[PDB]
Amino acid sequence: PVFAKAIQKRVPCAYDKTALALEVGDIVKVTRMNINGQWEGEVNGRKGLFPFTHVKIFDPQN
Amino acid sequence: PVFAKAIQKRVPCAYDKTALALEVGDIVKVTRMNINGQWEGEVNGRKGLFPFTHVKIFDPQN
Structure with a gap:
């Protein structure tokens, strides 16, 4: 063990x-x-990656 | 391919x-x-991992 300061x-x-x-x-x-x-x-306007579990497909005009 | 809604x-x-x-x-x-x-x-009380670059080990010499 030795001791240090968080800089x-x-x-x-x-x-x-x-x-x-x-x-x-x-x-x-x-x-x-x-x-x-x-x-x-x-x-x-944004795009990216994500877990598919966080969404559910739905029909664009119900 | 589809439209989904964030759930x-x-x-x-x-x-x-x-x-x-x-x-x-x-x-x-x-x-x-x-x-x-x-x-x-x-x-x-908390232990963990860290980058040495964030600390300065105390030097008995000043």
């Missing part, structure tokens, strides 16, 4: 630039599937 | 339960240091 802050959170963010209800135009358990899609 | 919020931030959180100034009991990137230490 720089360090957060245990990582950001995934490739991940599409989702709000419940956001409408997703899924664009590709089977990308290692993810689907690529887009909502509004 | 669950999803955030582009992933959490590393093994990473030791550091605040500038925190005193770190470094318990092990691999010449393999991350060092192991603890601040107060």
Whole structure:
């Protein structure tokens, strides 16, 4: 054991630039599937990857 | 291929339960240091992994 001082802050959170963010209800135009358990899609002007479990397909005009 | 609706919020931030959180100034009991990137230490009761670059080992000499 030895002791040291923390000179720089360090957060245990990582950001995934490739991940599409989702709000419940956001409408997703899924664009590709089977990308290692993810689907690529887009909502509004943003696109990215996400777990398909977070969405459900629906018929565009019910 | 389809349109789906977000049925669950999803955030582009992933959490590393093994990473030791550091605040500038925190005193770190470094318990092990691999010449393999991350060092192991603890601040107060919490132990975890961290990048040596975020700490300065105290030097008895000044």
